[PDB]
Write a protein that binds this ligand. Structure first.
Ligand SMILES: CC(C)CCC[C@@H](C)[C@H]1CC[C@H]2[C@@H]3CC=C4C[C@@H](OC(=O)CCC(=O)O)CC[C@]4(C)[C@H]3CC[C@]12C
Ligand SMILES: CC(C)CCC[C@@H](C)[C@H]1CC[C@H]2[C@@H]3CC=C4C[C@@H](OC(=O)CCC(=O)O)CC[C@]4(C)[C@H]3CC[C@]12C
Ligand SMILES: CC(C)CCC[C@@H](C)[C@H]1CC[C@H]2[C@@H]3CC=C4C[C@@H](OC(=O)CCC(=O)O)CC[C@]4(C)[C@H]3CC[C@]12C
Ligand SMILES: CC(C)CCC[C@@H](C)[C@H]1CC[C@H]2[C@@H]3CC=C4C[C@@H](OC(=O)CCC(=O)O)CC[C@]4(C)[C@H]3CC[C@]12C
Ligand SMILES: CC(C)CCC[C@@H](C)[C@H]1CC[C@H]2[C@@H]3CC=C4C[C@@H](OC(=O)CCC(=O)O)CC[C@]4(C)[C@H]3CC[C@]12C
Ligand SMILES: CC(C)CCC[C@@H](C)[C@H]1CC[C@H]2[C@@H]3CC=C4C[C@@H](OC(=O)CCC(=O)O)CC[C@]4(C)[C@H]3CC[C@]12C
Lengths: 211, 178, 178, 211
């Protein structure tokens, strides 16, 4: 039924004063709305309701209003605890629909990434699998293009990767590509390598090891 | 300040007995089980006070001619003062319940248990569909009858209390020149 | 047959004006939007001309002493006779609409369209959940509450109309010895 | 949830005065009940409701009442239009459950049945099937035991039969067992016969034909 669209996330926010996003809808929703603040590790907190009344018991320096399909909110104060995701919802007709989420960033400078290699171990291969890990660290932003090639051949649908959070000191991101590989395929292949590209490098770089 | 009702004050006190009868009748009528939170007029038992105060004044004005002493001539000031104070409290509570009905919750006035068991599952202060849709549903549009009934009852109560206070104020001002 | 009220007849006609005021006020207060099938008090408009008749009867006794001829001495009989006829019609309608409420549907009494459109999705005469279960539902509870309220207001109107008829019958039997 | 059981049907009712059946329930139903009259060819008609009030606009000579789990109804008048099915229902808790049906009979004397044979035709076998029909008529009651044997062998799960109604003159029942048979099986078999048994015969009788 009712579907909500949100402004693109990962917005580059310099340490200034302006901070504005939007949350649109397809069908004309009612005048009343609701905005909430979500924080990780504990229960979320209310932000503003009806776009005309402030929070109850929580001081609010925000300024959010609007009508129809376009709504505008702006915050000027810069506190060290506002960096979180933002959710927008609606209550026009049941069932209700929820947003996806927009997380703000800290405007950290780019860092030069590094690479590493690790051949499979005897104990690892004796279990019935072989995994090679390439360690990626000190890179910005979180978006990166990393792929694997074996014997100068391309493979797909075999890599599972998870990202990490941001530290409270420098907000440094790390990655570690790990793929579980079969022994039979490990025996008949010669060259294993991993390639990474980023804005900090002017030419792709790869590392290879002897089996 | 023109004194013109002293010689023909028999009717003014004559109507008071049956005015108190109206007050007690309305108080008894309003005590039907209606909701979870009773109005302010329930826990104060004001209608009994008003009815008794009016009927005793009517009994006092039964014999205007001098018959006895210290009973039909001395209490005429305490009676008027207590009636005026009761009327003052009357429209004070009247304006209170007519102002607190269109605004948010102020107090509870929890009802007694004997009426509590009979009507557990309906609220009188506010009924809302809790849903933006289904506005044309009986559970939403089917409170306004009793809402308007209570509003009219309170309005007529206030009007008649004001009239009774006015006539009593005139009567007491006739007795003493301030 | 004892004549003891003729000499004190000043108040008897003095209270009637505000009796009519109370009757018309109750009739107006009963005109709250309720549902589709309005009671018998709507299709006949009895409270309006009843209260008008009562207030005119009360104002007729403004000048008890002889002032003019053929207007304050001749109308005293027609007016009291028509007041008694209005009273007997009052008892007929009151007994009919007090007996028709606890029994099944008797007649129609459609309400006018201006108020009908406000609450056109409910009925006041009968409301059954149409299901043996879910007896503890807010709909039936609210029906019982509003039905009790209507019964109470109708009983109040009955009692005061009967008292008004009794005093009117007394005042009309005062004039003639049958 | 609530399940209703009914008295056995096909009750032998001699042309007398007494006529009584019952409709029981497992769980204790409410006091109010409902009985209806169903007739074939047009819409049914009401019989009695609440077991305490008569029909509206239809004269009722019946007498039905009861409480708890046992209910009794009795009709004394004998009209030529009361022979139909009887349905009992309940309205204690949703969803409601309906009965199965009890049909009254006319107490007709037993009649001697007859048998017939019919070999498959050339046009029938040229279509791709062969059916043999044994005609049964003038038998009472409708219940009968008819089976088929081929080459002194028993077969099952191949016979479909439908019954007929009762005439307004003598209430005579008829039957015609017909089984569709394949050509390949028809060619390799020798003896076809059908057997019927009834109270009117003291010994089973069978008829055979030459192919
Ligand atoms: C209790 C219900 C059913 C009837 C109410 C009776 C009153 C309407 C009547 C009864 C005696 C009447 C009183 C009789 C004598 C007088 C004297 C008169 O002077 C003032 C009116 C008064 C009190 C009358 C006021 C009206 C009274 C109280
Ligand atoms: C002043 C007199 C009346 C305005 C008040 C005083 C006591 C009140 C009554 C106290 C008890 C009841 C019982 C109540 O019905 C019941 O709870 C008893 C019936 C039942 O529960 O089966 C109806 C309201 C009523 C008459 C109350 C409303 C009207 C009364 C008589
Ligand atoms: C002899 C007469 C002149 C004495 C005075 C009687 C009327 C002039 C007064 C008494 C109470 C008043 C009523 C008090 C309350 C209301 C509720 C009011 O309802 C609404 O406007 C709200 C509608 C909703 O949204 O529910 C309608 C007018 C009405 C009946 C008022 C109409 C005029 C009334 C009947
Ligand atoms: C509140 C407003 C809109 C109406 C005020 C009502 C008065 C105009 C009526 C009500 C009762 C009437 C009284 C009824 C009886 C008598 C007895 C009579 O003797 C002297 C007039 C008097 C006091 C009447 C004076 C005029 C009164 C006070
Ligand atoms: C001489 C009079 C004082 C005798 C008493 C008549 C009142 C009891 C009736 C006459 C017209 C009725 C009114 C007709 C229409 C409405 C509109 C209703 O609100 C609406 O429905 C808004 C209009 C709409 O939405 O159509 C509030 C009650 C009210 C004032 C009714 C209140 C009761 C009224 C005033
Ligand atoms: C004065 C009192 C003696 C009279 C005036 C109106 C009478 C009331 C008229 C209507 C009712 C409704 C009645 O409730 C019902 O209609 C029955 C509800 C049910 O049993 O489900 C309770 C008694 C009561 C308050 C009567 C109690 C006695 C009252 C208050």
């Amino acid at each position: 039924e009712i579907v909500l669209t949100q402004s693109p996330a990962t917005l580059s926010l310099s340490p200034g004063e302006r901070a504005t996003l939007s949350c649109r809808a397809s069908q004309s929703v009612s005048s009343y709305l609701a905005w909430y603040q979500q924080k990780p590790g504990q229960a979320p907190r209310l932000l503003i309701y009806d776009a005309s009344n402030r929070a109850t018991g929580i001081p609010a320096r925000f300024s959010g209003s609007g009508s129809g399909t376009d709504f505008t909110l702006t915050i000027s104060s810069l506190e060290p605890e506002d960096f979180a995701v933002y959710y927008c919802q609606q209550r026009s007709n049941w069932p209700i629909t929820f947003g996806q989420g927009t997380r703000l960033e800290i405007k950290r400078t780019v860092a030069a990434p590094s690479v590493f290699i690790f051949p499979p171990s005897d104990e690892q291969l004796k279990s019935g699998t072989a995994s090679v890990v390439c360690l990626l660290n000190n890179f910005y932003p979180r978006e990166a293009k990393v792929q694997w090639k074996v014997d100068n051949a391309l493979q797909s649908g075999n890599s599972q990767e998870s990202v990490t959070e941001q530290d409270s000191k420098d907000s440094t991101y790390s990655l570690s590509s790990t793929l579980t590989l079969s022994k039979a395929d490990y025996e008949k292949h010669k060259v294993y390598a991993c390639e990474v590209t980023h804005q900090g490098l002017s030419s792709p770089v790869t590392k290879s090891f002897n089996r | 300040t023109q004194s013109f009702f002293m010689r023909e004050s028999k009717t003014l006190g004559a109507v008071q007995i049956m005015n108190g009868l109206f007050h007690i009748a309305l108080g008894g009528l309003l005590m039907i089980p209606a909701g979870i939170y009773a109005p302010i007029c329930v826990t104060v038992w004001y209608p009994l006070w008003g009815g008794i105060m009016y009927i005793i004044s009517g009994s006092l004005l039964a014999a205007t001619e001098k018959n006895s002493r210290k009973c039909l001539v001395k209490g005429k000031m305490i009676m008027n003062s207590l009636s005026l104070f009761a009327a003052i409290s009357g429209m004070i509570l009247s304006i209170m319940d007519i102002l607190n009905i269109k605004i948010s919750h102020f107090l509870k006035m929890e009802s007694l248990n004997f009426i509590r068991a009979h009507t557990p599952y309906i609220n009188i202060y506010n009924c809302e569909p809790a849903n933006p849709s289904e506005k044309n549903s009986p559970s939403t549009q089917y409170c306004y009858s009793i809402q308007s009934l209570f509003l009219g009852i309170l309005s007529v109560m206030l009007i008649f209390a004001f009239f009774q206070e006015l006539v009593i104020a005139g009567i007491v001002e006739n007795e003493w020149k301030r």
